[PDB]
Design a protein around this ligand. Sequence first.
Ligand SMILES: O=P(O)(O)OC[C@H]1O[C@@H](O)[C@H](O)[C@@H](O)[C@@H]1O
Ligand code: ALF
Ligand SMILES: [Mg+2]
Length: 219
Amino acid sequence: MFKAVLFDLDGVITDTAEYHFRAWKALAEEIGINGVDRQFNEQLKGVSKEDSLQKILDLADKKVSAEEFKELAKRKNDNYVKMIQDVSPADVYPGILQLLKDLRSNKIKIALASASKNGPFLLERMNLTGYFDAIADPAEVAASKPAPDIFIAAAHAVGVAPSESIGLEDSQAGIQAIKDSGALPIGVGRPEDLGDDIVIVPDTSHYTLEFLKEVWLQK
Ligand SMILES: O=P(O)(O)OC[C@H]1O[C@@H](O)[C@H](O)[C@@H](O)[C@@H]1O
Ligand code: ALF
Ligand SMILES: [Mg+2]
């Protein structure tokens, strides 16, 4: 039986992938780049703040100064941080709170494997901090998603091997990170976005302990 679950945050625990998208799209447009639509945004999910900005600049073969790059990343973060101030426990996605309770009651470790530097603040807004045994610090890993490092760090932080863990993700980059960590991925979203080669559920209500057990036994 698996011994840990490694959670992505944005688009898994709550609908903040939507807010990252809106904030990045707004930034892109301010700089005259119009290609950040929902389809392109699938390439941005899971990616660090700096890598996100770079992917956007690349879309338009645009170069900015180092000073401008720093200011643009700050402007997007400042906007995003404003957007999330009113997040509350009411915004926890369906199933997630119950899953945390059920994991905790079955002595399964719970770790956050988020790229977001806003992760701790969001878990506090949602009254979830006390369910997490560890939060992997995304500033500490030498490499970000789709590198596996953040998932490996999350597993190690709760004393479990990645191979004894499930990872939950909504992104292409994050699914790849889980695969390369040795943990078992279960995605949430559309197979058209996340692939047909892993288990994908259509919405978070499917993330029950019963189902995670259902998947572990088979794969
Ligand atoms: O800018 P932050 O809060 O550090 O977030 C980093 C990344 O965190 C990931 O969880 C999101 O999927 C990305 O969209 C985001 O860019
Ligand atoms: F959506 Al995340 F780390 F929270 F990629
Ligand atoms: Mg996500």
